[PDB]
Amino acid sequence: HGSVVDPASRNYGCWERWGDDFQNPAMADEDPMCWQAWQDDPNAMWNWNGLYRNGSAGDFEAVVPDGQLCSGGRTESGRYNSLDAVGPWQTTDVTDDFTVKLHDQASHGADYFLVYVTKQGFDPATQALTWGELQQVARTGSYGPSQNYEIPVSTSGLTGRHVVYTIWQASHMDQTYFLCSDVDFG
Ligand SMILES: [Zn+2]
Ligand SMILES: [Zn+2]
Ligand SMILES: [Zn+2]
Ligand SMILES: [Zn+2]
Ligand SMILES: [Zn+2]
Ligand SMILES: [Zn+2]
Ligand SMILES: [Zn+2]
Ligand SMILES: [Zn+2]
C-alpha cells in the first residue's frame, strides 16, 4: 500500500508536514485544510497509505461520485472524507514537466497509472472536484514490483493552482488508489 509522495497527496502532505507536531496551535492559521482533516479523523494522516478501493473493475466513475474524488468515493469507511473539503489546500510547486512519485511499501506493481489534472479555469480553492473538470495528462503501461514508481508527466498551458489526480491500479489484485495532489504551476 502507498501514496503519491511527490508532489505530495493531500493526506501524505498533511502527515509529512504536521505528523511530528499534529496539535500545533498554528496549524489552523497556516494550513487550515490540514487542520480540518486532522480534526475530522487523524487516522486519515496516520494511515496515509490506505486510500484505496477494492473491486472497481476499471469503472472508476461508477464508484467515485463527483465531489468525492479525493476520498476515493468516501472509501475505507469514510476515513478520508475530509480530503473532499473545498478550500485553500497547501500546494507543491511543479514545473510544466514533473514527476509523479509513489512510494509503495509492498512492491505490488501497477497494471497502469492514470494521471489527470484539473482544467484551466477550475478553482480548487472554491469548487468541488468533478470528473468533468479533469483532463487526462498521462496513461501508463504496467510497472513491475518496486518500492517506488515514477511517472514522467508533461503538460503545457497549465498555470497557477491545480489538482493532480493519480489513479494507481495495483497488480496483486483488483485494488485501486485515488490520490489528489494540490500543485502550483506558477
Ligand atoms: Zn499493500
Ligand atoms: Zn518530498
Ligand atoms: Zn491567517
Ligand atoms: Zn510557488
Ligand atoms: Zn514544456
Ligand atoms: Zn520511497
Ligand atoms: Zn517505506
Ligand atoms: Zn501560484
Q: Which residues contact 29 (CB under 8 A, 6 or more apart)?
A: none
3-class secondary structure, 93: strand
Structural gaps in the chain: residues followed by a C–N separation over 2.5 Å: none
Any alpha helices (H) in 41-144, and if so which ranges? 43-46, 60-63
Q: State in Å: Cα 186 to ligand 8 middle.
A: 4
* 148 labeled part of a ligand binding site: yes
Strands 161-170 and 92-93: unpaired
Q: Does 108 carry a binding-site annotation?
A: yes
CA atoms of 183 and 159, how far apart (whole Å):
10
CA of 97 to the centre of ligand 7 (A): 25
How many whole angstroms from 36 Cα to the centroid of ligand 7? 26
Angle 102-108-111 from CA coordinates, rounded to 5°: 85
H/E stretch holding 45: helix 43-46
Peptide bond into 7 cis (omega under 30): yes
Q: What's the CA gap between 53 and 74, in Å, rounded?
A: 9
Q: Residues with beta carbon < 5 A to ion ligand 4?
A: 93, 184
Q: Give the contacts of 30 (CB within 8 A, at least 6 positions apart).
A: none
Question: Closest Cα to residue 12, out of 39, 32, 34, 35?
Answer: 34
Resolution, given in Å to one decimal, reads: 1.4
All three cell numbers of 73: 468515493
Say if residue 162 carries a ligand binding annotation. no
Phi, psi of 76 (to 5 degrees): 50, 50
Is 1 labeled as ligand-binding?
yes
Instruction: Give 53's Cβ-side CA count (13 Å radius).
Output: 23
Domains defined along the chain, listed by start: 1-186 (2.70.50.50)
- The count of other CB atoms within 10 Å of the CB of residue 90 is 16
Enter the DSSP assignment of 84.
Answer: G
Q: Are 12 and 48 in contact (CB under 8 A)?
A: yes
Q: How far apart are the CA of 150 and the centre of ligand 7, in A?
A: 15
